[PDB]
Amino acid sequence: RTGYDNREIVMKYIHYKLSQRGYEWSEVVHLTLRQAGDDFSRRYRRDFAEMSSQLHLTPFTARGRFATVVEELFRDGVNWGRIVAFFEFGGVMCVESVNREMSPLVDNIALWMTEYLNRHLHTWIQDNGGWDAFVELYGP
Ligand SMILES: O=C(NS(=O)(=O)c1ccc(NCC2CCOCC2)c([N+](=O)[O-])c1)c1ccc(-c2ccc(N3CCC[C@H]3c3ccccc3Cl)cc2)cc1Oc1cnc2[nH]ccc2c1
């Protein structure tokens, strides 16, 4: 169903983000999310450089960091751009975890991302046409 899609969408996104850094951890939705995320990460490159320096990820701090950042991200509601930002931020947390020899946290972050999508973003996504609408709007 939709939830099986979301977990797959998270796993394929993280897998690509980590592969970009040399770490080995329909498809139109995945391709669209990759391309939109790559655009987002270039546009907001400076923002992520600043935020990554403020995260201080450890196994003890990671869950709280994820929770507070994502709550700030969606403070004014949901739209597709913020959903892209959510994936990009999760990708950044995963890359930082690997950078810090904390690679097991990738699995935790993937689970947190999946549970946030299924519990908090699923209603908006379906209310706004599902992932198919995202592909229509921003796909190649
Ligand atoms: O309204 C917004 N966005 S939109 O819906 O109009 C729209 C616009 C364009 C696109 N697609 C562009 C295509 C794609 C195909 O290829 C060709 C171009 C899409 N999309 O694809 O969905 C949607 C909008 C809301 C929020 C923030 C935003 C959030 C968070 C942050 N920060 C930066 C640091 C981390 C994060 C953060 C900050 C505070 C708290 C937590 C966090 Cl994590 C910065 C900006 C930016 C927004 O603008 C953009 C601008 N360009 C973007 N490009 C891709 C996504 C996108 C979003």
Q: At 101, which CATH number? A: 1.10.437.10
Positive or negative, the CA dihedral 30, 35, 36, 38 is positive
The method recorded for this entry reads X-ray
Kindly state the helix (H) or strand (E) to which residue 94 belongs, with its residue range. Answer: helix 80-99
Residue with the smallest CA separation from ligand 1 atom 16 is 36
Three-class SS state of 116: helix
61 with 102: CB under 8 angstroms? no
Residue with the smallest CA separation from ligand 1 atom 44 is 44
Number of domains into which the chain is organized: 1
Kindly state the helix (H) or strand (E) to which residue 60 belongs, with its residue range. Answer: none
Instruction: Tell me the CA–centroid distance for residue 139 and ligand 1, in Å.
Output: 15
Cβ-proximal residues to 88 (8 Å cutoff; 6+ apart), any chain: 37, 40, 41, 44, 48
CA atoms within 13 A on the CB side of 137: 13
Positive or negative, the CA dihedral 39, 41, 42, 43 is positive
DSSP H helical segments within 21-79, as ranges? 28-43, 45-55, 62-73
40 lines ligand 1 (CB under 6 A): yes
Alpha-carbon gap, residue 77 to 13, rounded angstroms: 23
Alpha-carbon gap, residue 85 to 74, rounded angstroms: 10
Instruction: Tell me the CA–centroid distance for residue 59 and ligand 1, in Å.
Output: 28
Q: Which atom of ligand 1 is nearest to the CA of 70?
A: 41
112 with 68: CB under 8 angstroms? no
Domain enclosing residue 97, as ranges: 2-138
Q: Resolution to 1 decimal, in Å? A: 1.6
- Return the number of other C-beta atoms located less than 10 Å from residue 54's C-beta: 8
109 with 66: CB under 8 angstroms? yes
Q: Which atom of ligand 1 is nearest to the CA of 48?
A: 34
Instruction: Tell me the CA–centroid distance for residue 47 and ligand 1, in Å.
Output: 12
136 lines ligand 1 (CB under 6 A): no
